[PDB]
């Protein structure tokens, strides 16, 4: 069957840099017959808020361990909301089974890690979709960390692509990769 | 259950821009077990068979109402083909069923209205994809209209990324949102 | 049903450009209720392994029968591992199926060519995403060939964007059709 992760909708502030917490993340991981999508977007709060074209990259990385559990460990963690969602309603269902470990990337395809860099437009409604108030976001698949078995990590890069200040008020991201087998 | 609603193959010009047919767009919105794909391409005619880097910019908007049936008001309408795609066939069925708000994108999800701002090649077989020969395509979930309940627009910008005239033959676009529940 | 047709993990030298094997090529064909989402990624050997701003561009096309059945004649071929993906393991099974011809790219759909250019981010983790570090890969879906029913072409363009030699370990890349009806 297919199976849904998820922060839920309105998230807290559950993205920390650095032992922060300043973004906001809304992450569905969802595995259909055989993939998995990443459907996710991201609002800066505090010193984040507004992003300026110096800003260093950054990562906010998931980390799970062998049953696709989210580790309290990543700068998404297990400290805030996460879960299955149900068929039919827009709860987190917080109790594990089983079936989370499908939403995991497969370790036997991504036995080294694997990214896919893609475009990341910011406020892009209030901007217009201007060509330089868009940055990157790169999605890693299983990069070593600490002693989680799956990691997702989200790296924003290239804040000098900015022609000045713009609101980290990021568009909605899809990435996609083979789904852990049961 | 999944369920597809889409224009059919060979749509009409129905794509209407100051009340007047200008662009055939193909639309297909793919509910599977949590996800909507939005899988879609776009042909201008008459004034905008060729765009160039003097285009101005515009929007097709998709009006739905609160059951997922496209409303009559929207740029692309419910005065042209649309409808469910049986597994199986290319027909489009147009009698309403309860599962049509599933293609719907899920308002708890996005309360407030969400973007994604991709590249949008054009005629990139003929011109073997140079990378002057693109445009961008947002898209923009629940941007508020009239008495919609939901909404989906297509908006293409940057036609001053353009090195000149080019024919208004999009490739194949693909966009991601949450569905809405039963 | 759903159905998955791939390369499997750990993909051979299966990428041949005038009868020499010279990429690693894995793809993945992942039919869900309506769409095929592509899932792919390519490692350069020998020739390959570098890649520079003066490369020829190139294709790698796949040919398929009127049952989906791959053909032995395009560049990645029949003479290579490919098959079935089962829910719950990660083997390749040649026995082929009715299903196969539902991962083909629907003909009624795409009658004419259709096309889709993307980013191809090259040894993206090694160079954090620097912009200059992609170059295009465009699937064309249905561009005639020879006696093949279906096709699918991966070509590789605009190397020129590249800022110098470069790994050709690319992102994972992922496309999006309508399938063929059973």
Chains 1, 2, 3 share one sequence.
């Not at 032992?19 to 709060?45: M, Q, W, Y």
């Not at 800003?55 to 989210?70: A, K, N, P």
Request: aromatic fraction near 10%; charge should be positive; proline fraction near 7%.
């Amino acid at each position: 069957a297919p199976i849904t992760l998820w922060t839920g909708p309105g998230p807290s502030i559950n993205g920390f840099i650095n032992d922060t917490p300043v973004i906001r993340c809304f992450i569905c991981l969802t595995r259909d017959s055989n993939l998995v999508t990443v459907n996710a977007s991201f609002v800066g709060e505090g010193g984040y808020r507004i992003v300026s074209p110096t800003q260093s990259q950054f990562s906010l990385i998931m980390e799970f361990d062998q049953f696709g559990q989210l580790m309290s460990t990543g700068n998404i963690n297990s400290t805030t909301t996460w879960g299955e969602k149900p068929w039919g309603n827009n709860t987190v269902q917080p109790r594990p089974s089983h079936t989370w470990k499908l939403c995991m990337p497969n370790r036997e395809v991504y036995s080294t890690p694997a990214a896919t860099i893609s475009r990341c437009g910011l406020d892009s409604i209030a901007v217009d979709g201007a060509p330089s108030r868009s940055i990157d976001c790169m999605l890693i698949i299983n990069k070593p960390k600490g002693v989680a078995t799956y990691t997702l990590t989200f790296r924003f890069l290239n804040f000098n692509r900015l022609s000045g200040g713009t609101l980290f008020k990021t568009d909605v991201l899809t990435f996609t990769y083979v789904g852990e087998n049961q």
